[PDB]
């Protein structure tokens, strides 16, 4: 399978629009900031449980300053292209899909009843769920097409299901990835819903964004289960998938907290001076979340910084942009 992605050797920033919507003016200022800081891409997390921030012809939602029309997205892609920045759509499925589901209930109540697993999740074991996913992604691919590099984050974080259900999650991801490849797009997913036993069945051109082996769990029984059953970085190296380091200690920050001088200073200084690209957040042999796991087998250096948006309505675009302008993501081990 073709894998033209270079995200595994790139530096980028992710904006959580699904929790903290932004308009075109603000997103252009983020793109500019990323370019000033020598980043290669900006990832737009366009939907989550809270908000649906892309217009879909199929879903029938109305556009606005923050529900980005195809024309607005095309303008942002053209702006990014002028600054030599890749714009990476990021539309979470099958979970973190509450806003898509609420809209689908209104315009396709039939399809909603078929595909709703829970309030946040489409039923990825059913053919109707893959059909929905490819319909939405095909629409977005066209809006994001007029640039050199084509990547979309499918996500697949925090997915509900049994171990048996997860077998069907692999199939869902692969079918969507193959559809995307037909449209010239590479696909990324998070690591946390990936079983060891499924990893070799996941297409090898799918990039895995590695945030936390435990999914930021502290319950010791959950940790034990994820240590035994969920992918490590060594597992991913053995399977041959590309990796992006999204270490949840070093690379995650809540928009809500921007402007807190000490916290901002620690995050920035740790990122800029202490963190290294081969340092992952994995479970150690003592059952601890070890955010400083050195992986000597990793030869690539990709890092994404994630700005998560819950409960951050009053944080301004200027504050977000100025925080990005402080970042110098490390490139050397
Ligand atoms: C990939 C991932 O981090 N998934 C979720 C869990 N993380 C952990 C830190 C945030 O809650 C963030 C949340 O906003 C995300 O939706």
Author numbering: -1 to 331
Authors' own words:
One key enzyme class is the poly-β-1,6-linked N-acetyl-d-glucosamine (PNAG)-degrading glycoside hydrolases, of which the canonical member is dispersin B (DspB) from CAZy family GH20. DispTs3, DispTs2 and DispLp all consist of a single domain with the expected (β/α)8 (TIM)-barrel fold for GH20 catalytic domains. The β-strands in the centre form a tunnel atop of which the active site is located in a groove, presumably to allow long chains of PNAG to bind. GH20 enzymes use a substrate-assisted catalytic mechanism, also referred to as neighbouring-group participation (NGP), in which the reaction proceeds via the formation and subsequent breakdown of a neutral oxazoline intermediate.
DispLp has a high sequence identity of 30% to DspB, but in marked contrast showed very little activity on these substrates. In comparison to the synthetic PNAG substrate, DispLp showed increased activity on the partially deacetylated natural substrate, suggesting a greater preference for partially deacetylated substrates. In the active site of both enzymes 6-Ac-Cas was distorted into a 1S3 conformation, which is consistent with the proposed catalytic pathway of GH20 enzymes based upon the 1S3/4E (Michaelis complex/product) conformation for GH20 enzymes that was first observed for the S. marcescens chitobiase. In marked contrast, the Kd of DispLp for 6-Ac-Cas was 1.12 mM. In the structure of DispTs2, Glu300 (Glu332 in DspB) forms important ligand interactions with the C4 and C6 hydroxyls of the pyrrole ring to stabilize the ligand conformational changes during catalysis. This residue is conserved in all dispersins apart from DispLp (Ala308) and the equivalent residue is a glycine in StrH. Unusually, DispLp has an alanine instead of a glutamate at this position. This substitution could explain the 184-fold reduction in the dissociation constant of DispLp for 6-Ac-Cas compared with DispTs2 and 6-Ac-Cas. Interestingly, there are two waters in the DispLp structure that superpose well with the OE1 and OE2 of glutamate (Glu332 in DspB and Glu300 in DispTs2), one of which is coordinated by Gln252 (corresponding to Leu or Val in the other two dispersins); these waters might compensate for the Glu/Ala substitution. Therefore, as well as implications for its catalytic efficiency attributed to a loss in hydrogen-bonding capacity, DispLp might be able to accept a β-1,4-linked substrate since there would not be any steric clashes from the 4-position, with the groove now 3 Å larger.
